[PDB]
Write an enzyme that holds these catalytic residues in place. Structure first.
Site, PDB file in Angstrom:
ATOM      1  N   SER A  61       0.804  -1.216   0.000  1.00  0.00           N
ATOM      2  CA  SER A  61       0.000   0.000   0.000  1.00  0.00           C
ATOM      3  C   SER A  61       0.841   1.273   0.000  1.00  0.00           C
ATOM      4  O   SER A  61       0.287   2.359  -0.199  1.00  0.00           O
ATOM      5  CB  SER A  61      -0.955  -0.009   1.197  1.00  0.00           C
ATOM      6  OG  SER A  61      -1.843  -1.121   1.149  1.00  0.00           O
ATOM      7  N   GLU A 269      -0.349  10.042   5.019  1.00  0.00           N
ATOM      8  CA  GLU A 269      -1.069  10.371   6.243  1.00  0.00           C
ATOM      9  C   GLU A 269      -0.263  11.409   7.012  1.00  0.00           C
ATOM     10  O   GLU A 269       0.944  11.239   7.217  1.00  0.00           O
ATOM     11  CB  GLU A 269      -1.305   9.123   7.098  1.00  0.00           C
ATOM     12  CG  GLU A 269      -2.218   8.098   6.440  1.00  0.00           C
ATOM     13  CD  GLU A 269      -2.189   6.746   7.135  1.00  0.00           C
ATOM     14  OE1 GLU A 269      -1.408   6.580   8.100  1.00  0.00           O
ATOM     15  OE2 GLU A 269      -2.950   5.849   6.714  1.00  0.00           O
ATOM     16  N   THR A 310       2.081   3.036   6.129  1.00  0.00           N
ATOM     17  CA  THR A 310       2.389   1.617   6.150  1.00  0.00           C
ATOM     18  C   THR A 310       1.855   0.955   4.887  1.00  0.00           C
ATOM     19  O   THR A 310       0.882   1.415   4.287  1.00  0.00           O
ATOM     20  CB  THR A 310       1.790   0.937   7.384  1.00  0.00           C
ATOM     21  OG1 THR A 310       0.359   1.025   7.338  1.00  0.00           O
ATOM     22  CG2 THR A 310       2.290   1.599   8.654  1.00  0.00           C
ATOM     23  N   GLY A 311       2.501  -0.135   4.497  1.00  0.00           N
ATOM     24  CA  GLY A 311       2.083  -0.903   3.337  1.00  0.00           C
ATOM     25  C   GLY A 311       2.498  -2.349   3.483  1.00  0.00           C
ATOM     26  O   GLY A 311       3.552  -2.655   4.049  1.00  0.00           O
TER      27      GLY A 311
HETATM   28  B1  LIG Z   1      -2.156  -2.243   1.999  1.00  0.00           B
HETATM   29  O1  LIG Z   1      -2.873  -1.074   2.689  1.00  0.00           O
HETATM   30  O2  LIG Z   1      -0.643  -2.426   2.179  1.00  0.00           O
HETATM   31  C1  LIG Z   1      -2.928  -3.295   1.139  1.00  0.00           C
HETATM   32  C2  LIG Z   1      -3.898  -4.100   1.724  1.00  0.00           C
HETATM   33  C3  LIG Z   1      -4.574  -5.048   0.963  1.00  0.00           C
HETATM   34  C4  LIG Z   1      -4.266  -5.202  -0.385  1.00  0.00           C
HETATM   35  C5  LIG Z   1      -4.993  -6.218  -1.221  1.00  0.00           C
HETATM   36  O3  LIG Z   1      -6.066  -5.903  -1.711  1.00  0.00           O
HETATM   37  N1  LIG Z   1      -4.474  -7.432  -1.436  1.00  0.00           N
HETATM   38  C6  LIG Z   1      -5.267  -8.506  -2.018  1.00  0.00           C
HETATM   39  C7  LIG Z   1      -3.096  -7.800  -1.131  1.00  0.00           C
HETATM   40  C8  LIG Z   1      -2.994  -8.330   0.283  1.00  0.00           C
HETATM   41  C9  LIG Z   1      -3.297  -4.395  -0.966  1.00  0.00           C
HETATM   42  C10 LIG Z   1      -2.623  -3.449  -0.206  1.00  0.00           C
END
Ligand SMILES: *[B]([O])([O])C1=[C][C]=C(C(=O)N([C])[C][C])[C]=[C]1
Ligand SMILES: [Cl-]
Length: 355
Positions: A61, A269, A310-311
């Site tokens: 993310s 953020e 965060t990601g």
């Molecule tokens: B994130 O905020 O780092 C993030 C959460 C979920 C997803 C997603 O839709 N999938 C399927 C990957 C886990 C992407 C990014």
């Protein structure tokens, strides 16, 4: 005192590798335009290849920051307006219910009816179109923030449609070179696959990110620690960069609304600096991340700000944070997910020890 950068990370980040069985980690710190790079463990357990300056991690993310930068680049260039609607660029969406949400509301997750992920049925390009065609409103548009990949994913597609290029080319041919990034990819080429780290799930099984609907603008960027330190340096010193990318970066440093102590900027953020530890941790709470929350106008415009994000993918964790008035920033890249609170706590301890 310049040597304590290496020592402070070993105290706060290094113990996390053994605590959560993380094969590899890359922690970078920038202070007064000086970069520090610390690498731990292996990018591939089975290959016994250690994490180095060329190791490519999945940003998850954190990719949304580059999507936001891309939107800021198109807005300054006159290709879009934050008041425009997706039907102006994706013509099949004109007069549809989703055409009542402006691009700024898509980028900041206030459409009122978009969850964290697409439904499991939405996979192909046609099914993505059928999703936004049949999209019906729920909450009043612009009033509720719900962290959403479809929301900012559509925002990124509209940005690409306004630049007459697919999204992956917008980042790789325009945004990444403007930022001075050398090994940042939406699609990792074959000549770099040996540097592409394996991710590891909770069973410590090697995995990598799978194709998904609108995956590129939502979580499809892979990068290295030197590139992410350059991205932080660009955010700390935009005035040193060419006018097109400089104004793009500045578009991502403006809060648009608040949810408790968090200011939602474009991708980033934003928080009042100095921030308490619990303030930063609350941004990643289940209440803020998973649930809808009513937004409020920015009342106290913080003169001294800080930004983080965060990601995560299934096998990678990421955290980036910078403080402009202190001219300091940090990046954490891991090839296994660790709790978001742990990433924030460790970076909180490192930054405060370097004034
Ligand atoms: B994130 O905020 O780092 C993030 C959460 C979920 C997803 C997603 O839709 N999938 C399927 C990957 C886990 C992407 C990014
Ligand atoms: Cl169309």
């Amino acid at each position: 005192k310049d040597q304590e950068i290496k020592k402070l990370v070993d105290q706060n980040f290094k113990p996390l590798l053994e605590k959560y069985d993380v094969p590899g980690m890359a922690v970078g710190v920038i202070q007064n335009n000086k970069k520090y790079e610390m690498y731990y463990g292996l990018q591939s357990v089975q290959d016994k290849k250690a994490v180095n300056s060329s190791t490519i991690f999945e940003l998850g993310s954190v990719s949304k920051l580059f999507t936001a930068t891309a939107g800021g680049y198109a807005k300054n260039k006159g290709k879009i307006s934050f008041d425009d609607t997706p039907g102006k660029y994706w013509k099949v969406l004109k007069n549809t219910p989703i055409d009542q949400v402006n691009l700024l509301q898509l980028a900041t997750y206030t459409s009122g009816n978009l969850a964290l992920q697409f439904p499991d049925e939405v996979q192909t390009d046609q099914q993505v179109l059928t999703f936004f065609k049949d999209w019906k409103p729920k909450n009043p548009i612009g009033e509720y923030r719900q962290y959403s990949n479809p929301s900012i994913g559509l925002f990124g597609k509209v940005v690409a449609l306004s630049m007459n290029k697919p999204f992956d080319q917008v980042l790789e041919k325009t945004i990444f070179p403007a930022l001075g990034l050398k090994h940042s990819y939406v699609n990792v080429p074959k000549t770099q696959m040996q540097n592409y780290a394996f991710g590891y799930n909770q069973e410590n099984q090697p995995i990598r990110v799978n194709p998904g609907p609108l995956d590129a603008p939502a979580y499809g960027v892979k990068s290295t620690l030197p590139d992410m330190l350059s991205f932080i340096h660009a955010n700390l010193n935009p005035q040193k960069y060419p006018a097109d990318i400089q104004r793009a970066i500045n578009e991502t440093h403006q809060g648009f609304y608040q949810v408790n102590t968090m200011y939602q900027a474009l991708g980033w953020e934003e928080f009042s600096y100095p921030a308490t530890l619990q303030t930063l941790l609350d941004s990643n709470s289940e209440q803020i991340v998973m649930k809808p929350n009513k937004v409020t106008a920015i009342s106290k415009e913080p003169s001294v700000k800080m930004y983080h994000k965060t990601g995560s993918t299934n096998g990678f964790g990421t955290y980036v944070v910078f403080i402009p008035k202190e001219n300091i920033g940090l990046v954490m890249l891991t090839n296994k997910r660790i709790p978001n609170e742990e990433r924030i706590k460790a970076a909180y301890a490192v930054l405060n020890a370097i004034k």
